[PDB]
Design a protein around this ligand. Sequence first.
Ligand code: MYA
Ligand code: BXN
Length: 411
Amino acid sequence: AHAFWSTQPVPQTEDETEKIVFAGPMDEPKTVADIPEEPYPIASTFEWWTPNMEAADDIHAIYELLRDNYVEDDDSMFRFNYSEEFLQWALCPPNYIPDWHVAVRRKADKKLLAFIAGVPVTLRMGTPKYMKVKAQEKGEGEEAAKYDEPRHICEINFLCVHKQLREKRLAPILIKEATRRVNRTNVWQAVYTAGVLLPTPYASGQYFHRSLNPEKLVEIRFSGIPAQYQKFQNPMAMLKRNYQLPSAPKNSGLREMKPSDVPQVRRILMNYLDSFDVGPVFSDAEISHYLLPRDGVVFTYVVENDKKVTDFFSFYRIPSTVIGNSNYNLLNAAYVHYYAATSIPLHQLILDLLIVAHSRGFDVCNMVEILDNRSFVEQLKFGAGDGHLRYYFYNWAYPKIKPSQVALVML
Ligand SMILES: CCCCCCCCCCCCCC(=O)SCCNC(=O)CCNC(=O)[C@H](O)C(C)(C)COP(=O)(O)OP(=O)(O)OC[C@H]1O[C@@H](n2cnc3c(N)ncnc32)[C@H](O)[C@@H]1OP(=O)(O)O
Ligand SMILES: Cc1nn(C)c(C)c1N(C)S(=O)(=O)c1c(Cl)cc(CCCN2CCN3CCC[C@@H]3C2)cc1Cl
């Protein structure tokens, strides 16, 4: 049923994943020297290209490919429009490997036809807590703990094939060449997410959405007017009233994050994320890169009291092109990023996130039900959406876990 994925080191069915008890690799052990030195063969009219994602025109080329060809909703009403500044941020974290950014161009005119990107991440991906309990009962604690040390792996994102080249088996070639380049760097696992169902997720979470500009969301058919609103004479004014938010944050001591906050934010974030079965481990440099504010891209606020950072939240911007409605070009979405609360309830912290996002002109706040995101859904008027985000490993057997045991945000 899967001419490509059946040949790959991933669990092949849900029934197989249901039987996995310990974390660990799936493929035969290999070394860098076993991996082909030469790029994977591609047809003569095409060439491999490694873009320089710190060069403005290379970023712009990838930006255009994604703008016109990346993920759409199922009704082709919206398509992600990640900005050039966002792409540079997401693709060039500390110690990133340029060779892991893989493109295909038409050799004749250098037209960009396809892209896939990998970035390094340090991930805790050892056997989850519930399976360690079973392992202990069975005398298998050592094997269950074998791969507990955080692992330096690849995170894959931004797979895209031009619309005119679809269903020609180019995606498997891109994946194969990315795998080769990552393996040549002595890295053997990857983590990736998708909205679609592939073999075989270790976790899946529903998307949730918080209306910030409901009149726009209804107009573009992102949101509907619930049936119960028809019992009122003006359902739209009632809708706006329901979603209204304060004009300024409520938490005393909230301010934008600054460079000197990096060590404190690292400590509180790492203390929080260590409670989840799967999660990243961030250095100071990675905290700085992923969390310090960048205009139009990432927004991060801390709660400071007694000159100490006790809480923080972050969100990032991904607009989507509104394909079918001529009255609006873009849907401006804020996505919940990392956060940590030690002094206030999480719903009180995330209310300030919604306020800041609304004040800055965002139309909706999106998130997946990872981390403790479910704990503020009802209080802050998030609604479940149609979409899901499925989490996958390449070359890593892993038991099924709930999305609330996942602490890795994927951009
Ligand atoms: C150690 C290091 C390892 C590094 C790599 C780790 C693995 C990373 C894996 C990538 C993680 C990416 C994470 C994200 O970015 S998820 C976002 C994916 N991008 C989009 O949805 C953008 C719009 N769509 C496209 O650009 C294309 O339709 C794509 C590129 C998605 C498929 O192109 P096309 O439509 O022209 O099809 P084909 O004829 O070339 O190929 C068909 C084969 O492709 C399999 N397919 C379809 N969709 C996906 C998908 N989203 N992940 C993995 N495989 C997918 C499909 O099952 C079939 O295989 P099989 O069913 O026959 O077996
Ligand atoms: C406004 C809007 N624009 N677009 C393009 C869509 C679909 C919408 N919606 C309608 S949606 O409700 O907001 C929504 C929906 Cl249905 C489904 C999904 C499934 C995940 C898609 N990918 C896969 C690759 N990447 C991994 C990490 C981020 C990214 C997520 C995501 C969303 Cl974000």
